[PDB]
Amino acid sequence: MTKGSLKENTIAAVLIAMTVALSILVVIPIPATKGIVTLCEVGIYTSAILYGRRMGLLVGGASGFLIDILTGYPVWCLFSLVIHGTQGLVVGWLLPRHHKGIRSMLLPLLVGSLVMVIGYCLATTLLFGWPAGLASIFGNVVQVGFGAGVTLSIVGPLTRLKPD
Amino acid sequence: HRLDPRAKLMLSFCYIIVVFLANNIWSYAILIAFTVGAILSSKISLGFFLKGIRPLLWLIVFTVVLQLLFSPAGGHTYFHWATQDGLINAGYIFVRFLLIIMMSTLLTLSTQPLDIATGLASLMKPLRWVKVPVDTLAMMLSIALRFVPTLMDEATKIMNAQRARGVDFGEGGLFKQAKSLIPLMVPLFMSAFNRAEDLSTAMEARGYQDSEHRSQYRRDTVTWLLFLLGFVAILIFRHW
Amino acid sequence: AIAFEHVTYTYQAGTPMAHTALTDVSLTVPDRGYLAIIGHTGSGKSTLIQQLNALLKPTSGTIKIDEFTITPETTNAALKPLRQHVGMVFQFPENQLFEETVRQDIAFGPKNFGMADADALALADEMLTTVGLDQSYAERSPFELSGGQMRRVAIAGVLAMQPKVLVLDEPTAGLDPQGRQEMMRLFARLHQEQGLTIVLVTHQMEDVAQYAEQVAVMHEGRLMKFGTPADVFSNREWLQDHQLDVPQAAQFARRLRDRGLTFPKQPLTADQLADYLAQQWAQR
Amino acid sequence: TENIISVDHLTYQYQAPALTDVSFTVHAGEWLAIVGHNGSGKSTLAKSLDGLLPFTQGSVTVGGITLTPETVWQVREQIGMIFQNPDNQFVGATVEDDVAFGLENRQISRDEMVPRVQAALAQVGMTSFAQREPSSLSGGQKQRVALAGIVAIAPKILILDEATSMLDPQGRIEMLAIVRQLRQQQNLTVISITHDIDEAASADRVLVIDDGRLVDEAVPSQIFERGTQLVEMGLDLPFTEKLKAALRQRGITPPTTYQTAAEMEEWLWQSLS
């Protein structure tokens, strides 16, 4: 899978740094009452749709792991590494096609998003606990909605640009 | 209170499964003895602890109260007792919340964010045998980690710049808010691309060339063997 | 227009870790002013700057800017038009670009406050041609432009809001000498022909010597010296110990002073020094 | 002697600007400085010198190893590099790792690496900054520890691709100073593609490029005689030149030949007094 490429190996690092930075920084207050920290998943999904593609799973996983360390709940680090790490890959591998059109991105985003929703739900419902799973479902559903929406909003303009 | 700190990452790795791989009442006595012992050993000063439990307090209340109310028997509208199982289970999940949250805070305050990447590089060593590149992930993770703070300084200045020219960040609802995130996200991505391209030509021209290989610039075994003994003691009783 | 009154600010509020980025700041910048803030990094210059467009509400004291009145009690909602009133240019403004075309990019500014879209695009073209050069660049993508040109596009985007007070956080940074020259002459041009109150945080002493009408010296969150460049640059040694220094014209004037001739005032600029030398040239 | 360049070309004019029929040679330990507008390649030539940016035509040979594809790293060995923007090109988790970064990947070393790193940081004087991460400092300091990092290699050639382009006057003057003392100690060739008049004045020789073609080449003192035309040439005016221009704007005619501050002062005092 990994080679790794000359420029791409650095691009992944920078994008991870960006996602983590945005994760710690940017807060998105929902209309009562939680927040949307996983706008980093915008960076994840976008990194998966841009070039992307399979390799974007690094930008998904390592970043989320670091987020778990920094935000932070270090105990969940492996879980997030797996959930996000596979999430970005589910978006990436399912994406092409040839990036043509919005729907072409709309379909794989739905599947990859469920990996987070179902993943964290099972992650919660393990140490926990019947209500924690439901709460995780709701929160991560709103969060997935925001992330996918923003990603869809950006990825258009970006594909026209983008180095490689 | 710093230590190895390479083993703390393994603590973060194992504490998750160790947490639920134990019923009772007895393994809880072992677990609490271990955790409280670690807390007392590592200073604290419960301020950051209680302030750490503070945001998740709503989730603790929600989970415990739902685990209760959906158990005495609650469903089909009837309370009283029989329920006690749900009571002690709610207590179990409450103490569970306390343990996981406080240990999360302790682990957060323990390690300095720097050496964690090198620790990851050290722990990924066996993975070398599985053909998985270790040094590439190590360099990538180190560069990313060191670029995390400087990208925060960048993300703030971009937001301030856009706010200065009319962009109203943070305001509701959600669609109009997500549309507002674009003038922040788009510049950052393109800046990240330039950040990498300049870094690629930098590393290429630098003394480090195209390598990927190969060069790298007593309390350890104690607490981990203690962790092993405690973990075995937990493995003894577990009701299954 | 601008008027600080016993202003002070601190990260982060009363709770630790406390760090007063500013303390007891009082000053007044008149209409058509041209303030130049000088000092080291982290000396409170950036805080003083962000204090203008209400990016940072003061912990104490008041900030009167024309009709506006900034106070610690002031809410975020009421400070909405203050941003269109006070334009700002952060260091390396190119980064603020994002639109697919420079026309819509420059027009994006007013569009948030107002705005009639067609009038916004037309105003975007107007600002496009008023900034440096950039004629008919409207259809071209900003990312395709050079660094300096992108800086001109961003600056035009800021100017599109029709601000009465322009703020510049080291705008000539990274630019080639011609870029810096043309940009500074652009700022002076807007200053003299349009409004225009202009705040200018820099390190280049020459631009302050030539263009600035008044100087504000910062040093760890406190406005120590304040006044005309003649008053500020009068005491050289004070600046020397503050790791600053008088302009090259003043230094060379001291060089000609030790030899030495006399001058009615300390020459801050090569033009002034040339005048003072020309008079004595006519005499002797 | 050290850097022979008979012919050079770049096909991007059909990104990095352009180059056509560029030709020059760099002497040993020579303080070279390349200047020009924006239409000039400049940074293009800087990219071509190290090894990156594969040219379509021409040939460049760093004495004595010739370019490019197979011997690129061989040429890159004896060549230090400093780029603009010190936030980038740092790559290290901290100053120490940043300095050791260049040393690391040459199959050596581990044990002898440490005292060499400490000696380099001692040489730049930032020894008390190895503990600090780049996300805390400073502008000229990150560039200075990048300079320490590349000087840890101790190459025969050093390239400054506008290192002081994005620095405060403090960090810029300081950097130029430590580069001067570095020249004093190690004695090495320093090619600096910049637009800083102080650096160009520090140079022993100045190449002026325009439209991808080397239009001029002379001693900095002779280059400064271009007066007001210096800005268009992408280089600030010496204050003596500013004063002379301001004087000829006022009837007084100063000497055409370039003069330092001391010479200008002496001539001025000689005139009226």
From TrEMBL, chain A:
InterPro entries per the UniProt record, alphabetical: ECF_substrate-spec-like
Gene Ontology CC terms, in alphabetical order: membrane
Parts of the chain that traverse the membrane: 12-30, 42-67, 73-95, 107-128, 134-155
Entry keyword Transmembrane: yes
Keywords tagged on the record: Membrane, Transmembrane, Transmembrane helix
Entry-linked Pfam families: ECF-ribofla_trS
Name this protein carries in UniProt: Predicted membrane protein
Natural source organism: Levilactobacillus brevis (strain ATCC 367 / BCRC 12310 / CIP 105137 / JCM 1170 / LMG 11437 / NCIMB 947 / NCTC 947)
